[PDB]
Design a protein that fits this description.
Chain B: This is Spike protein S1. This is part of a larger assembly, with two copies of chain A (50 residues). The first copy, chain A, is largely without helices or strands and 50 residues long. Chain A is 0% helix and 8% strand. At the A-B interface, loops of A face loops of B.
Chain lengths: 50, 50
């Protein structure tokens, strides 16, 4: 979608692993605010949005 | 921004009381650590305070 009409998707009720993301997308930019990616596979969350 | 004071963001294991570490080393990335560069991981240990 375009920025002024971005698309949002709710992801919850599932087993999430953030180690497979490194595969997809050469990752021209990959940075986090408030968390660090290496520790992200560990914490537990309420409801994750995309 | 006063770029004269920095702080260690990446450490393998925490440190015992009252020791200081001044070694500059590039973080690893689940493979033989990047020898001079920075990808998804392999970030620089020191970040300026500014």
């Amino acid at each position: 979608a375009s920025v002024y009409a971005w698309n949002r998707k709710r992801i919850s009720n599932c087993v999430a692993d953030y180690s497979v993301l490194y595969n997809f997308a050469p990752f021209f930019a990959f940075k986090c605010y408030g968390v660090s990616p290496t520790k992200l596979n560990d914490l537990c969350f309420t409801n994750v949005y995309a | 921004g006063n770029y004269n004071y920095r702080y260690r963001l990446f450490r393998k294991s925490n440190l015992k009381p009252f020791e200081r570490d001044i070694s500059t080393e590039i973080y690893q990335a689940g493979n033989k650590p990047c020898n001079g560069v920075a990808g998804v991981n392999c970030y620089f240990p020191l970040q300026s305070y500014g």
